[PDB]
Write an enzyme that holds these catalytic residues in place. Structure first.
Site, PDB file in Angstrom:
ATOM      1  N   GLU A 180     107.214  -6.286  41.317  1.00 30.15           N
ATOM      2  CA  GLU A 180     108.364  -7.133  41.606  1.00 30.15           C
ATOM      3  C   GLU A 180     108.329  -7.594  43.058  1.00 30.15           C
ATOM      4  OE1 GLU A 180     110.770  -8.124  39.545  1.00 30.15           O
ATOM      5  OE2 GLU A 180     112.197  -8.988  40.972  1.00 30.15           O
ATOM      6  N   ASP A 201     108.079  -4.049  36.899  1.00 27.52           N
ATOM      7  CA  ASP A 201     108.446  -3.939  38.306  1.00 27.52           C
ATOM      8  C   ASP A 201     107.478  -3.103  39.127  1.00 27.52           C
ATOM      9  OD1 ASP A 201     110.875  -5.445  37.993  1.00 27.52           O
ATOM     10  OD2 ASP A 201     111.774  -3.661  37.072  1.00 27.52           O
ATOM     11  N   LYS A 212     116.704  -3.570  27.231  1.00 24.23           N
ATOM     12  CA  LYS A 212     115.386  -3.527  27.856  1.00 24.23           C
ATOM     13  C   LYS A 212     114.335  -2.894  26.955  1.00 24.23           C
TER      14      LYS A 212
END
Ligand SMILES: C[C@H](C[C@@H](C[C@H](C[C@@H](C[C@@H](CCN1CCCC1=O)N1CCCC1=O)N1CCCC1=O)N1CCCC1=O)N1CCCC1=O)N1CCCC1=O
Ligand SMILES: COc1cc(CCNC(=O)c2nc(-c3cccc(C(F)(F)F)c3)[nH]c(=O)c2O)ccn1
Ligand SMILES: [Mn+2]
Ligand SMILES: [Mn+2]
Length: 180
Positions: free
Chosen positions: A65, A93, A119
């Site tokens: 990320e 991420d 998610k």
């Protein structure tokens, strides 16, 4: 233009994080000048991701990320091609060099239960670890494997509640909660 949310984000978060969040919204067709709440969420998510990578050892994590979409996909290709882990569906991420798995960080304005379900439904190849934090100080990770030590995780929840407190002190939190 001229939103209190924008001036608080610029005053509360790091200049580099603000710059990193602005590029991500520019690149994905969003405008931090008007989409000011998603601007605050992108900054929060970035900071949490950075504190999390700081919680382990020196060479523990690889930060995905905060990189432009093309460079982010390049490093996961190198990670997949040298470790053997399967290519994640959407962009994650982090990557754990100690646990040998990708990590998906999440920051929510709701029950930690609901977000993780969301998610989890988009990453059917459930090889990627999922970790949810909340603005009320709750957290929620895959297989109860919270990865880091309690002290590093507690620092994250403390900062999250400060942001919610500063947001509420300016009468900004009500709009931020009822928007996620
Ligand atoms: C270097 C450049 C940007 C790095 C920056 C990233 C963020 C890190 C900053 C450190 C310093 N601290 C610690 C004290 C406060 C601070 O500010 N933290 C952690 C806490 C909040 C924060 O901001 N980190 C992590 C390793 C060291 C470093 O600097 N980033 C941006 C996205 C990906 C990345 O690695 N790089 C390097 C190559 C690509 C790039 O963009
Ligand atoms: C602003 O640039 C973008 C980028 C994308 C694709 C890449 N995104 C991520 O990687 C991601 N996004 C979030 C997130 C935070 C707030 C709201 C939302 C949602 F409402 F859009 F769902 C998502 N949280 C994460 O933890 C996370 O990893 C999509 C949209 N905008
Ligand atoms: Mn991400
Ligand atoms: Mn994430």
């Amino acid at each position: 233009r001229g939103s209190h949310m924008e001036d608080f984000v610029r005053q509360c978060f790091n200049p580099m994080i603000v710059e990193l969040a602005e590029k991500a919204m520019k690149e994905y067709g969003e405008d931090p000048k008007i989409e000011t709440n998603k601007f605050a969420a992108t900054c929060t998510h970035l900071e949490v991701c950075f504190m999390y990578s700081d919680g382990g050892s020196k060479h523990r994590f690889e930060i995905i990320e905060g990189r432009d979409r093309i460079m982010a996909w390049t490093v996961v290709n190198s990670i997949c091609n040298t470790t053997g882990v399967e290519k994640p569906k959407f962009l994650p991420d982090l990557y754990d060099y100690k646990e040998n798995r990708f990590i998906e960080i999440g920051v929510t304005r709701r029950e930690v239960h609901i977000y993780y379900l969301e998610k989890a439904n988009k990453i059917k190849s459930e090889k990627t670890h999922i970790h949810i934090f909340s603005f009320t100080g709750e957290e929620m990770a895959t297989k109860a494997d919270y990865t880091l030590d309690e002290e590093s995780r507690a620092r994250i929840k403390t900062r999250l509640f400060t942001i919610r407190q500063e947001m509420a002190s300016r009468s900004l939190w009500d709009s931020f909660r009822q928007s996620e």
